[PDB]
Design a protein around this ligand. Structure first.
Ligand SMILES: [Mg+2]
Ligand SMILES: [Mg+2]
Ligand SMILES: [Mg+2]
Ligand SMILES: [Mg+2]
Ligand SMILES: [Mg+2]
Ligand SMILES: [Mg+2]
Ligand SMILES: [Mg+2]
Ligand SMILES: [Mg+2]
Ligand SMILES: [Mg+2]
Ligand SMILES: [Mg+2]
Lengths: 98, 127, 96, 151, 114, 206, 79
RNA sequence: CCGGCCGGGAACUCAAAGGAGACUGCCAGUGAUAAACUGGAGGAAGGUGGGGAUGACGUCAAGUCAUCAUGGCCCUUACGACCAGGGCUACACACGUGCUACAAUGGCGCAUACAAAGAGAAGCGACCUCGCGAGAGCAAGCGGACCUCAUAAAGUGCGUCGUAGUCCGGAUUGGAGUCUGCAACUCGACUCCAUGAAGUCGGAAUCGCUAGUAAUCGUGGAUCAGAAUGCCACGGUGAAUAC
């Protein structure tokens, strides 16, 4: 009935706003279709390391981006005030509706 | 209840289901032949039924995706012996000496800045 | 990299949206089976840098018009420097 | 090979017959990892040879292979100034890694239309030792035995 | 078995034989045999006279051969008369299209010596 | 040169990160420039306020910004006053509203940056480089620190022909990823050119 | 060879071509516009085409039309 | 509606967080009763399992004042700044690095099976339609395990070619076109028709690679309006050899 998307580069953190949000539900109203892991899209950026020349040098950086799904089935108005007002985790992207 | 073994090789994952019955085989909803039974390694899906007899004693329906011709046929091969699981650990000893137990861990190695491909090195001229 | 080569590019983003995207899509359809009255294209006498792809793409920090990257808007040289000091969120020396 | 002496991967005996040996053959004729198309060209020459010799298949191959088999070879040895060609008695196992390699390689440098044909024509010329490859034995013999003096 | 140009080709599948003409490049020969009502994979033996000169008309349609050659050589002069870039190039023996000349403009510049 | 940046290689492990926000491909850049624009201004201001490190976060349409200083009061000014004139411009530069916390630097002798900075500032003052190098390394081994190395570089004192010269006292295992290594950098801008300071401070492990 | 939908030509030039049609030619006729496609309404004139250092005279004719003004003003002095 | 498609099903494939597992530790031989090697066991993995990252003190006044910074020096109505057009793309030559071939282990037509990994709103663009075609008009879905890019190719089956400068090879050039862009003259990519160089496997000499590697086969990305045989990344099939 309502699912919230989570992404953040940090992983030892995202599931702790997940397992957090999850908890702040299965306590209150509940249902919650568990937290789904979901494809970690990881960009790579490979660049030349020497200011001048030396094309075989190069550093090879990446940016992992993790997701979680949530899905809450029964929307209680308490459960619905349980995400609201109890949320935090600044570097975590959360998407409400779809 | 269904007796099963995974079996996966080089980026191919085949799931293999057994049931005492005929010697009929389905893969990806298809005849053994109709998939790759008529190609390089038709004879290898069979293999895992050697010292362990059949010809039409047990039935096996499977699916498999990822990789290619021989990697898919490799997985399945590994899933058969892994499903012969059900029929004891007395047969899965010359399934060892068959070399069929093992997980063929050979993957493809990465392209690496500075080279042409994994090991291939740019020809260099001295002068 | 030379104030003026910088200045040039600011002038170009400026113009790039005073007109183009705006005044310039008077061209988009203006050239599309509405045929004809040639005054159509001709109009193209506008500032020149007015066009978007008259813009280069420079390391937001230094001005380097080479070794640029869109994610970060910086040159590989200033990127690595920021990467190593954390500074760039999420980014570390990857391996696989 | 400075230190780490080794063994050898043991490829999987011929999908059609059950022979470690032909697997070595196919792999040797094979090119650009085209195994599929590789075992095609071998059996098709074995098909012609088999009947163009009658005498079976397996055993027809071995007696034509029994020819180009070498026994002694000249291993270099660059010592005090001189390259010194030192004849040495060569292993049984390498005795056909070559033989097969000279056969395959001989039919490649050849004029018949398809490779299956050429292969058959080497197999068959060698059968009655009178092929290019058999001459590669009637030469590595010549070039050893001359350095016979050395030993 | 001449068809069209002084050329006299045949003794193999038709579609390929036709290519012999100066002005056919497969696509035309497919368009010819098709519009002639002929099986492309036919030799000429069987291909009795009846069919042969039906073709000769189909080919007659395009500016092939010496006419083609003249027409083409004409165009190359046109450039040279005009004294434009692509012409000045044609007279100089160097590549018209833009290919670098610092190296490997050989097919146009012709083999090396000095 | 050929040493992997010590801080950089650790980030995944044992070392933090001085920018932690999320953004997608689009604003990612626009952010970086903002960040490197706020640290820019802020460091020119709290220059003589011993600041060792400024972290940034943009909490949903807002910018947080922490400022690690070994002179917390001087930054904060007469009962809040300064932080205000900071917040002001810091939000004028981030395109959004701005909080701005002021984390304290206990035992600044342990901060690579505040170390380097002082060595850097001592040269400009006009002091012996061997002397400074030695002071640093000491009050450091002193207040803990299972090791530290500082090196300098170039025209040390005046040389036409330039040098490096280091000091590795204690332990500094730059190959062990577990090892807590606070590594930083400062540059002296002197009358006969520029001297580059690198310091490593080995604190622990796990 | 490109364009497809409305042959191109600079304004100040094309009007520099009608300041001599209605009038009758003057001396040469400078354009840097090596860009432009040559138009029938230019045949008979002499247009001065910049090549990098100066403007080359080019009498226009009955087949210099689908060609650029630049195609007749060489730019790299080679010998 | 024979489409996992709708109920559903929590088994399995996978997804991504956490866990266990491998230690010469177990048998045995070798070796000083040591270190180790060797072979055997079981095991998905045996002997730093495979790959990566990680590059000590230092050597070459090695390279970078043009990424930026910076001591000193020099110009300052010019060594700075603006604009147009050209040039960095020139062409007797030489060298390096590559790409495409000389072909039947192949070419071509047709049918057809099996990947991985990435990219996407000033974007990826389905569909339908028009165009032989590159493309074009129209238009859905997707910030995306949803939707799009996108129908992998090697391969396999049939047929065709029959060893020829050929149905091998695609250079160069004429003609006519497509898209981007203010603008394809110099110098953009691509397409249709025609065109069909050298080249039949390369002297002296020289390089790569020890296994999922070499070889071969397609796939994606960064930069980027446009402009990849380069670069970076991806799996398919898949060797020979080491006294
Ligand atoms: Mg590969
Ligand atoms: Mg500057
Ligand atoms: Mg551009
Ligand atoms: Mg060349
Ligand atoms: Mg180590
Ligand atoms: Mg130099
Ligand atoms: Mg200065
Ligand atoms: Mg240049
Ligand atoms: Mg061809
Ligand atoms: Mg060859």
């Amino acid at each position: 009935r309502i699912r919230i998307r989570l992404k953040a580069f940090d992983h030892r953190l995202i599931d702790q706003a997940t397992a957090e949000i999850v908890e702040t539900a299965k306590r209150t109203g509940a249902q919650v279709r568990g937290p789904i892991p979901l494809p970690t899209r990881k960009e790579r950026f490979t660049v030349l390391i020497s200011p001048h020349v030396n094309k075989d040098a190069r550093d090879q950086y990446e940016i992992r981006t993790h997701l979680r799904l949530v899905d809450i089935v029964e929307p209680t108005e308490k459960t619905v005030d349980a995400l609201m007002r109890l949320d935090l985790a600044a570097g975590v992207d959360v998407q409400i509706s779809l | 209840n269904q007796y099963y073994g995974t079996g996966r090789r080089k980026s191919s994952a085949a799931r293999v289901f057994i049931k005492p019955g005929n010697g009929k085989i389905v893969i990806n909803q298809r005849s053994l032949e109709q998939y790759f039974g008529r190609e390089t390694a038709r004879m290898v899906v069979r293999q895992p039924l050697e010292l362990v007899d059949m010809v039409e004693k047990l039935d096996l329906y499977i699916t498999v995706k990822g990789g290619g011709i021989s990697g898919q046929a490799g997985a399945i091969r590994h899933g058969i012996t892994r499903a012969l699981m059900e029929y004891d650990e007395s047969l899965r000893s010359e399934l060892r000496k068959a070399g069929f137990v093992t997980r063929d861990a050979r993957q493809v190695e990465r392209k690496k800045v500075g080279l042409r491909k994994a090991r291939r090195r740019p020809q260099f001229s001295k002068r | 990299a030379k104030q003026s080569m910088k200045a040039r590019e600011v002038k170009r983003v400026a113009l790039a949206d005073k007109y183009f995207a705006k005044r310039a899509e008077l061209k988009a359809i203006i050239s599309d089976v509405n045929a004809r009255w040639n005054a159509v294209l001709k109009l193209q006498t506008l500032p020149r840098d007015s066009s978007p792809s008259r813009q280069r793409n420079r390391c937001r920090q230094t001005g380097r018009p080479h070794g640029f990257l869109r994610k970060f808007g910086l040159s590989r040289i200033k990127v690595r420097e920021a990467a190593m000091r954390g500074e760039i969120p999420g980014l570390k020396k990857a391996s696989w | 090979p400075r230190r780490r002496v080794i063994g050898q991967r043991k490829i999987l005996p011929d999908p059609k017959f059950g022979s470690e040996l032909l697997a070595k053959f196919v792999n040797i004729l094979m090119v650009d990892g085209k195994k599929s198309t590789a075992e095609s060209i071998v059996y098709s020459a074995l098909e012609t040879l088999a009947q163009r010799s009658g005498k079976s298949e397996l055993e027809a191959f071995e007696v034509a292979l029994e020819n180009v088999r070498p026994t002694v070879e000249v291993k270099s040895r660059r010592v005090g100034g001189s390259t010194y060609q030192v004849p040495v008695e060569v292993r049984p196992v390498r005795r056909n890694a070559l033989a097969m390699r000279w056969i395959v390689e001989a039919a490649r440098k050849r004029g018949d239309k398809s490779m299956a044909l050429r292969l058959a024509n080497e197999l068959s010329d060698a059968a009655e030792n009178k092929g290019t490859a058999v001459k590669k034995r009637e030469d590595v013999h010549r070039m050893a035995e001359a350095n016979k003096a050395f030993a | 078995a001449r068809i069209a140009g002084i050329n006299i080709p045949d003794h193999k599948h038709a579609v390929i034989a036709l290519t012999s003409i100066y002005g056919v490049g497969k696509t035309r020969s497919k368009a010819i045999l098709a519009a002639a009502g002929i099986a492309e994979d036919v030799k000429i033996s069987e291909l009795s006279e009846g069919q042969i000169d039906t073709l000769r008309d189909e080919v007659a349609k395009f500016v092939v051969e010496g006419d083609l050659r003249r027409e083409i050589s004409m165009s190359i002069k046109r450039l040279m008369d005009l004294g434009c870039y692509r012409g000045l190039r044609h007279r100089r023996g160097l590549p018209v299209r833009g290919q670098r000349t610092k190296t490997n403009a050989r097919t146009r510049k012709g083999p090396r010596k000095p | 040169g050929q040493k992997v940046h010590p801080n950089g290689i650790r980030l995944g492990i044992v070392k933090p990160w001085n920018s932690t926000w999320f953004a997608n491909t689009k604003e990612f850049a626009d952010n970086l420039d903002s960040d490197f624009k706020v640290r820019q201004y802020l460091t020119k201001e709290l220059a003589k306020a011993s600041v060792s490190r400024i972290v940034i976060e943009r909490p949903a349409k807002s910018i947080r910004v922490t400022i690690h200083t070994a002179r917390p009061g001087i930054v904060i000014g007469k009962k809040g006053e300064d932080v205000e004139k900071l917040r002001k411009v810091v939000a004028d530069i981030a395109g959004v509203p701005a909080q701005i916390n002021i984390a304290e630097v206990r035992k600044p002798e342990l901060d690579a940056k505040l170390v380097a900075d002082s060595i850097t500032s001592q040269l400009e003052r006009r002091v012996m480089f061997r002397r400074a190098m030695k002071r640093a390394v000491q009050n450091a081994m002193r207040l803990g620190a299972k090791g530290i190395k500082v090196e300098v570089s170039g025209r040390l004192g005046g040389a036409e022909i330039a040098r490096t010269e280091w000091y590795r006292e204690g332990r500094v295992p730059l190959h062990t990823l577990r090892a807590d290594i606070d590594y930083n950098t400062s540059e002296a801008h002197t009358t006969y050119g520029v001297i580059g300071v690198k310091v490593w401070i080995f604190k622990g492990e796990i | 060879r490109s364009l497809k939908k409305g042959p191109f030509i600079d304004l100040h030039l094309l009007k520099k071509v009608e300041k001599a049609v209605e009038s009758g030619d003057k001396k040469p006729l400078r354009t840097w516009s090596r860009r432009s496609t040559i138009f029938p309404n230019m045949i008979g004139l002499t247009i001065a085409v910049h090549n990098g250092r100066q403007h080359v005279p080019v009498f226009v004719t009955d087949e210099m039309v689908g060609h650029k003004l630049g195609e007749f003003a060489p730019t790299r002095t080679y010998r």
